[PDB]
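Changelog note: in this version the structure field was regenerated for every chain. One regenerated record is shown below for reference.
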Amino acid sequence: GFVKILKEIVKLDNIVSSTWNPLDESILAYGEKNSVARLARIVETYWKLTIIAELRHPFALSTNQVTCLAWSHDGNSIVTGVENGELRLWNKTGALLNVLNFHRAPIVSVKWNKDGTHIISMDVENVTILWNVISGTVMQHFELKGSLGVDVEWVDDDKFVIPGPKGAIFVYQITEKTPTGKLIGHHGPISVLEFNDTNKLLLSASDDGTLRIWHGGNGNSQNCFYGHSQSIVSASWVGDDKVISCSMDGSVRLWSLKQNTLLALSIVDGVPIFAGRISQDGQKYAVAFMDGQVNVYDLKKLNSPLPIPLYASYQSSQDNDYIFDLSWNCAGNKISVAYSLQEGSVVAIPG
């Protein structure tokens, strides 16, 4: 009955991607193309943007854009990865803590474990590394191999999953090189791996157009959701009984585990979605369409063939640039939009 039109509150330089601090609603980390990322604070007085620190990566002895950023769960540390494969660890104030260099290809995913002592990193060539992030040492290295997928995930304080051949998902324990199990079901590269630490279920998405929910540490999946007609680009848990996904088919779909069925969906026919992100409170889902428009969907009533209510939209006819990434601040009142070429934008999300 009313769609909000979002406004920009802060203009950024061009950014490749960004991620807000998990515990401080005012701190944003963003990667840039010139082998550098920055930590910034955004506070209202209007809105003021202040750079906290520069997180620079040297060019290799031999383009080197920052391709990945990941805050620790406690929000005190952050890992940045660049095109040449190097990873650097920093404190939230900017101090360099450690240099973790082993990958030789662009970093695509970095996941921190529960207590902030280990991370799993994976590059475009699917080389996956388990690091003791404090000592900066390589504990395990995996080369299971086109792309096998672009995500990895921790499923316990000492257990994790990574994409394997032919759509399989391999399960590992920190102290063992041999997989403890294999999750077989997908028929294409793994695009998303999200573990829910409350219901203890793993959500996976694949280029095969399906989502799977896994309970067992080996074997078949608990749920398999068909519906998307093209690759799934993003997927998230919505509480403990639902999952939401978006795809290149231009649709956003909310699924029910309790009823094993599609609960609701919204679509912009012919307009692919490049990325989707769930808010901290799990009540809003923001997606970036190929046409440069950002739609924020409201899941509130659905959580209290149905359509997913459109809460707000961000767009303008002054440029036709693509949006490659978006991120929510922890309070859910700001979203950082990363355009492919033009300046980034921080937009306010009304409550």
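Spot check on this record: The two ends are 16 Å apart (CA to CA). Residues 1-351 form a domain with the Methylamine Dehydrogenase; Chain H fold (CATH 2.130.10.10).
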